[PDB]
Write a protein that holds these residues in place. Structure first.
Motif, short mmCIF file in Angstrom:
data_model
loop_
_atom_site.label_atom_id
_atom_site.label_comp_id
_atom_site.label_asym_id
_atom_site.label_seq_id
_atom_site.Cartn_x
_atom_site.Cartn_y
_atom_site.Cartn_z
N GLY A 1 -3.02 2.77 1.59
CA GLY A 1 -3.67 1.89 0.48
C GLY A 1 -3.62 2.39 -0.86
O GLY A 1 -2.68 2.78 -1.49
N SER A 2 -4.98 2.57 -1.59
CA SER A 2 -4.84 3.14 -2.96
C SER A 2 -6.15 3.78 -3.08
O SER A 2 -7.25 3.30 -2.51
CB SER A 2 -4.72 2.02 -3.80
OG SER A 2 -4.99 2.43 -5.29
N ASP B 1 -6.19 -3.49 0.21
CA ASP B 1 -6.32 -2.72 1.51
C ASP B 1 -6.53 -3.97 2.36
O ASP B 1 -6.66 -5.10 2.38
CB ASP B 1 -7.89 -2.47 1.17
CG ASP B 1 -8.39 -1.37 2.35
OD1 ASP B 1 -7.47 -1.00 3.31
OD2 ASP B 1 -9.55 -0.92 2.65
N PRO C 1 -9.56 5.06 1.62
CA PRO C 1 -8.26 4.14 1.74
C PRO C 1 -8.39 3.73 3.30
O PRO C 1 -9.24 4.00 4.18
CB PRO C 1 -7.24 5.30 1.69
CG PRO C 1 -7.76 6.54 2.20
CD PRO C 1 -9.11 6.68 1.36
N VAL D 1 0.95 -1.42 -0.03
CA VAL D 1 -0.04 -0.05 -0.03
C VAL D 1 0.80 1.21 0.04
O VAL D 1 2.30 1.38 0.11
CB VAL D 1 -1.02 0.04 1.04
CG1 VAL D 1 -1.94 -1.28 1.24
CG2 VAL D 1 -0.10 -0.10 2.57
N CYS E 1 -6.71 12.51 2.60
CA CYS E 1 -7.74 11.50 3.34
C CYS E 1 -8.96 12.06 3.87
O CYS E 1 -9.88 11.46 4.09
CB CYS E 1 -6.82 10.77 4.10
SG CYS E 1 -7.48 9.08 4.76
#
Length: 232
Positions: free
Chosen positions: A169-170, A176, A213, A143, A151
């Motif tokens: 994460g992505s 995830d 994420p 990740v 975020c």
């Protein structure tokens, strides 16, 4: 873990599985021969130490070694259902010997800087999809650290990410952590190939959802708290 791969024994030696009455419920990370760090929410409902056990290795099935829990410490400011201050410590009944397959991760100093864009890894025995069951074999996923501002955007978590949290994460999803991975490790390496614990799997909107994420407890923000309770 969603979008990950199975690991070989010895790759992530600090990974632990926390089991209640013999069933996997959360991940944890070995930080000392007798101490594990995990998430506070793992102990919200089931809080009797005597019924919790910890196992190490890459499988829950033929566990290399198991340990009982002597004590559980949840952060004083944690308050269910809120996700803030989601951190816990668990003292093992007996020390775990340091081997190539099982040993502690390093903890970053409170001033350590993990930069957005940094490649990190999250590991766990959690679900492969939303509402799925835990796996018997440990998995890992690569990740990326996402800055708090991004975020916290309206389409993302809309200001819900506090300074005791970190996002990784992505944005497109794909990889995830998921249910069952909670309390597990999010690590990154320094230039010396030494691994540090950057975060603790905490929460998220479902699993592998675009624009949502994974959220992790930020270790640097709670580093001194760990010392205050363990001396580490």
């Amino acid at each position: 873990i969603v979008g990950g791969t199975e690991v070989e024994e010895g790759e992530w030696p600090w990974q632990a599985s926390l089991q209640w009455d013999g069933s996997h419920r959360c991940g944890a990370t070995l930080i000392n021969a007798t101490w594990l760090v995990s998430a506070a929410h793992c102990f919200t409902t089931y809080k009797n130490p005597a019924r919790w056990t910890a196992s190490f290795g890459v499988t829950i099935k033929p566990s290399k070694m198991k340990r009982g829990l002597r004590r559980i410490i949840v952060h004083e400011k944690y308050k269910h259902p809120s996700h803030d201050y989601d951190i816990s410590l668990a003292e093992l009944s007996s020390p775990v010997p340091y081997t190539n397959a099982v040993h502690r991760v390093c903890l970053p100093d409170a001033s350590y800087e993990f930069q957005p864009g940094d490649v990190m890894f999250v590991t766990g025995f959690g679900a492969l999809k939303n509402d799925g069951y835990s796996q018997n074999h440990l998995r890992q996923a690569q990740v990326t650290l996402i800055d708090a501002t991004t975020c916290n955007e309206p389409q993302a978590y809309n200001d819900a990410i506090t300074p005791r949290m970190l996002c990784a994460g992505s944005l497109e999803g794909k990889t995830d952590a998921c249910q069952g991975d909670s309390g597990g490790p999010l690590v990154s390496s320094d230039a010396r190939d030494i691994w540090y614990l950057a975060g603790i799997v905490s929460w998220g909107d479902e699993c592998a959802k675009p624009n949502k994420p994974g959220v992790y407890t930020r270790v640097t923000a709670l580093r001194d708290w760990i010392t205050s309770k363990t001396g580490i």
